[PDB]
C-alpha cells in the first residue's frame, strides 16, 4: 500500500522529532542519574523508552508505505543546566512535537489515509498525557513545592 509523498515527508519529520526527543530524554535522564535524582531518572528513562517505541511505530508506518525512513537527521538539542531548565526544555520540545503531530493528523485526514491518522492520534494521546502532562505537572510542582523541596522529592532515597 503506497503512501502519499506528503504523508511520507510528514512522517519523516515526525520521526526525526521523536528521535531527537529520545536523544534529549536520554541525556536528561543520565544527567539526573549523575546528580542523584533517582526517581526523576526512573521517570525520564521510562519516557525515553516510550519515545523509542514511538519512533519504532513511526518507522514501521513509513516502511509500510514504501518510503525510505530518515533517521540520520537530528534536530538541535536543548540540554538544561539544572533540573528546572531541563524540564522547561522538555516541555517546550514536547509542545513543538504536539504541534507537528496535529499538523500531521490534519494532513492524514486530508489525504484519505486513516491508519496513519490512527497511529498519529495514538502518538498524540501519548505525547499529551504521558509526556506533556507530567512535565507541566512537574513545572507547577517546582513552582509550588519550592526548588529545595522538589529536589528532595526527586532525589528519593539517599
Amino acid at each position: 500500500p503506497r503512501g502519499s509523498p506528503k504523508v511520507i515527508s510528514v512522517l519523516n519529520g515526525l520521526l526525526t522529532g521523536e528521535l531527537t526527543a529520545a536523544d534529549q530524554y536520554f541525556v536528561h535522564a543520565r544527567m539526573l542519574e549523575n546528580w542523584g535524582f533517582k526517581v526523576l531518572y526512573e521517570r525520564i528513562e521510562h519516557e525515553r523508552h516510550d519515545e523509542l517505541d514511538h519512533a519504532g511505530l513511526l518507522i514501521n508506518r513509513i516502511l509500510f508505505l514504501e518510503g525510505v525512513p530518515d533517521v540520520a537527521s537530528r534536530a538541535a538539542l536543548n540540554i538544561g543546566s539544572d533540573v528546572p531548565k531541563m524540564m522547561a526544555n522538555d516541555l517546550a520540545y514536547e509542545l513543538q512535537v504536539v504541534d507537528e503531530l496535529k499538523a500531521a493528523i490534519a494532513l492524514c485526514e486530508s489525504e484519505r489515509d486513516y491508519d496513519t491518522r490512527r497511529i498519529l492520534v495514538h502518538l498524540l494521546e501519548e505525547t499529551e498525557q504521558d509526556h506533556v502532562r507530567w512535565l507541566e505537572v512537574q513545572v507547577g510542582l517546582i513552582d509550588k513545592l519550592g526548588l529545595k523541596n522538589y529536589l528532595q522529592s526527586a532525589a528519593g532515597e539517599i
Partner: protein, 153 residues
Amino acid sequence: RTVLAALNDVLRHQLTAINQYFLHARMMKNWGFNALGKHEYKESIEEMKAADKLIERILLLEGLPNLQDLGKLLIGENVPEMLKNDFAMEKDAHADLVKTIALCEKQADYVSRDLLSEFLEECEERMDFYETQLELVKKMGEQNYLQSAVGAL
C-alpha cells in the same frame, strides 16, 4: 413529610459534597498532588456511598429523592483554599445533620435517625481531618505540606 424534607435537604448537601470532593480530587491530581488527590477521591467515594444509603432510606419511606438540586460548590484555586472550603462545607453539614437528627428523634422515627447519626460520625471525622490539615499546613509550611501532599514523584 417533615422528616422526608429534612432527608432530602441532607441528600442535597451530600450530593454537593460528592461533587465538590470529586472536583477537588481531580484538580489535586491535575496539579500532581497524588496523596491529597487520592484521599479526596476516597472521601468523595465515601460520600457517594453515604448518598446511596440515604437514597435507599428515602425510597424506603415512600418519598421522592430530590437529586435535581445541588448546593453551591466552594471551589478553591490552591490547595489550602480547597482544604478550608471542604472544612466549611463539612461544618454546614454538621449543623444541618444535628438539626435533622433532633427532628428525627422528635418524630419517633429512629432508623433514619441512626443512619443520620453514623453520617454525622463520618462528617465529624472529616471535619477533624480538614481542621488538622489546615493546622498542619500552618505548622510545617505550605511548601512542606505540598511536598507531603505530592507523595511519590
